[PDB]
Design an enzyme around this catalytic site. Sequence first.
Site, PDB file in Angstrom:
ATOM      1  N   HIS A 155       0.818  -1.210   0.000  1.00 34.94           N
ATOM      2  CA  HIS A 155       0.000   0.000   0.000  1.00 34.94           C
ATOM      3  C   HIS A 155       0.861   1.274   0.000  1.00 34.94           C
ATOM      4  O   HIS A 155       0.354   2.367  -0.233  1.00 34.94           O
ATOM      5  CB  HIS A 155      -1.048  -0.011   1.122  1.00 34.94           C
ATOM      6  CG  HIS A 155      -0.517   0.397   2.461  1.00 34.94           C
ATOM      7  ND1 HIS A 155      -0.225  -0.514   3.453  1.00 34.94           N
ATOM      8  CD2 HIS A 155      -0.235   1.618   2.975  1.00 34.94           C
ATOM      9  CE1 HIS A 155       0.224   0.127   4.518  1.00 34.94           C
ATOM     10  NE2 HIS A 155       0.223   1.422   4.256  1.00 34.94           N
ATOM     11  N   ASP A 167      -0.070  -7.588   1.684  1.00 35.77           N
ATOM     12  CA  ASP A 167       0.414  -6.207   1.712  1.00 35.77           C
ATOM     13  C   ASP A 167       1.933  -6.172   1.898  1.00 35.77           C
ATOM     14  O   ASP A 167       2.456  -5.883   2.984  1.00 35.77           O
ATOM     15  CB  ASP A 167      -0.303  -5.417   2.809  1.00 35.77           C
ATOM     16  CG  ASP A 167      -0.061  -3.922   2.714  1.00 35.77           C
ATOM     17  OD1 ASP A 167       0.472  -3.473   1.680  1.00 35.77           O
ATOM     18  OD2 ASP A 167      -0.411  -3.207   3.688  1.00 35.77           O
ATOM     19  N   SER A 203       3.506   3.830   7.941  1.00 38.36           N
ATOM     20  CA  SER A 203       3.305   2.389   7.741  1.00 38.36           C
ATOM     21  C   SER A 203       4.409   1.808   6.822  1.00 38.36           C
ATOM     22  O   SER A 203       5.285   2.554   6.398  1.00 38.36           O
ATOM     23  CB  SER A 203       1.912   2.129   7.171  1.00 38.36           C
ATOM     24  OG  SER A 203       1.685   2.918   6.016  1.00 38.36           O
TER      25      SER A 203
END
Length: 193
Positions: free
Chosen positions: A36, A80, A153
Site C-alpha cells: 500500500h 500487503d 506504515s
Amino acid sequence: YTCGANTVPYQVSLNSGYHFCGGSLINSQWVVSAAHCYESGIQVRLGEDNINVVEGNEQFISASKSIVHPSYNSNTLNNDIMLIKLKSAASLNSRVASISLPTSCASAGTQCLISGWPDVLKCLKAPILSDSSCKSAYPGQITSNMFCAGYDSGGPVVCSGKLQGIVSWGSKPGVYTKVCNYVSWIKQTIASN
Ligand SMILES: [Ca+2]
C-alpha cells in the site's frame, strides 16, 4: 517512545519529496515495505533518525525497481508486501544494517519491536496477539497473511531478531503483514532481479 538515534539500523524512510512510509533493509540492495506504500519516484533513506535534519549518518539512494506482491489486494490489504531495489548497494555499517528474514513464523505472546515515524524514530514493544483476539477485533477482515500485535506504515515488526511483520493497517490492535508466509517469494524475487 523515542528509540534513540540509529538504534534500529535496518529501519528505512521512503521519500518521494517527504517521508511517506517506512521499510526494512534486508540486504545491501533490497528493502521490504508494504504494497500500500507503492508510488513512483522513491528515494530510500538509510541511517535516519531526525528525518528533517542531516545528522551525518544518512545514505540516500534512489530506488531502481519496485515489485508489489502478485496477489496484493488493495481493498482488503491481503498480501500487503512489496520489494524495493536500491540503484546502488548501501554501504553497511553499525547504523545501516540488514535485518534477517524469518525461517519460521512467530508465536502468540512473543514480544516484538515496532518502529516508525516528533521527527525522530519512535518505538513500541508489543506482544503478538492470539489468532482469536486478532480476528475478534476485526471480524471478517483478517486473513492467514496477517497478524495483530498490541494491547507511518510499511515499517518493521521484529521479533527475536527476525522481520516477522510489516506495518499494514488497523484502527483495536495493529494489523501486520505476516512475513513468514512470504519468505520463498522474497528470496526468489530478489535473486531474480
Ligand atoms: Ca536525518
